């Protein structure tokens, strides 16, 4: 909850003094953080998909939702209704804890982390990160990391804009 | 495979109903709770 207390005390004055909001309820606020892991190879054998479910659980303390196709694609031998990977939706104190864990542990633990892209926005105030390589904190349990697949890590906000989101994540800790 | 079926009241041993079923999708002997007008109640009707 250190991150939430920061968001309340340090960020919001430091944010409003710049952005000139006539009310605190214009504040950019992190509404959720979504994790996704697409697999595809699960169509070959979904035991790796069970493994991805396992790792999302180990990472978050939160069982994931298995996603499924709304279509069939002969190019990948893909059938509608079959499990393409998994996702998670963190909200609240768990979400803040996860983000703080990222910034304070597992962004440095990438082999060559000198920063991240600044342009990775949607043009509407929501950020999209991607782990190319797993095994970024100790409780990833390296003894059983069969494969590195990666993650999409969406960070949704009430931010109107790229600028609001960027400054928010700056004060929160994201090393752009 | 898809077959037309006479159900039957397990008590009266009276057929009382005609219906349809797969054998693949419904291999176990089908059952329902259906009205037996000879008893004028509801009863377990089992396929035969």
């Amino acid at each position: 909850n250190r991150l939430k207390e920061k968001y309340i005390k340090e960020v919001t004055p430091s944010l409003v003094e710049k952005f000139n909001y006539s009310s605190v309820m214009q504040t950019p606020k992190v509404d959720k953080i979504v994790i996704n892991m697409g697999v595809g190879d699960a169509v070959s054998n979904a035991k790796n998909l069970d493994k991805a479910v396992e790792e999302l659980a180990l990472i978050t303390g939160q069982k994931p939702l298995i996603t499924k196709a709304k279509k069939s694609i002969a190019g990948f031998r893909l059938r509608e209704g079959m499990p393409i990977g998994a996702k998670v939706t963190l909200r609240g104190e768990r979400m803040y804890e996860f983000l703080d864990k990222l910034v304070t542990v597992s962004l440095p633990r990438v082999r060559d982390f000198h920063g991240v892209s600044k342009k990775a926005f949607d043009g509407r105030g929501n950020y999209t990160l991607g782990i190319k390589e797993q095994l970024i904190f100790p409780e990833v349990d390296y003894d059983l990391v069969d494969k590195v697949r990666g993650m999409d890590i969406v960070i949704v906000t009430t931010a109107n804009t790229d600028e609001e989101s960027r400054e928010l994540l700056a004060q929160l800790g994201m090393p752009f | 495979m898809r077959v037309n079926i006479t159900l039957e009241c397990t008590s009266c041993k009276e057929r009382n109903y005609l219906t349809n079923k797969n054998k693949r999708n419904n291999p176990d002997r089908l059952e329902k709770q259906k009205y037996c007008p000879r008893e004028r109640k509801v009863t377990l009707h089992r396929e035969t």
Binding site: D31, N126, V156, T158 | -
Partner: protein, 117 residues
Amino acid sequence: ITKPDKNKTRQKRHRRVRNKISGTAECPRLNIFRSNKNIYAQVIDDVAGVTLASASALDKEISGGTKTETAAAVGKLVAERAAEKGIKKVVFDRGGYLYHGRVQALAEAARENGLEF
């Protein structure tokens, strides 16, 4: 990010209930509305488009701070006003909400107090 408006979703579900319940002079609606704070309850003949009774936690007569008990109280009072008006039978328009909480307590209170849904 945007969020749906609870009241607009309520109105969608409400119309979906309206297409199979409607009030009459012989069996009116008991129309619920529910806020974050308070709860309102009208009694309506849809034929004339005219009410017959009302109740609310915003009426100075209730007891209880718990919203569920306020709901029960307005159930008592709207049942009283309906029996005074001269009707006992009614249709229960749940407004687009669930018959689980404040709404359930209100309706159960009115049923006890005499009405026949």
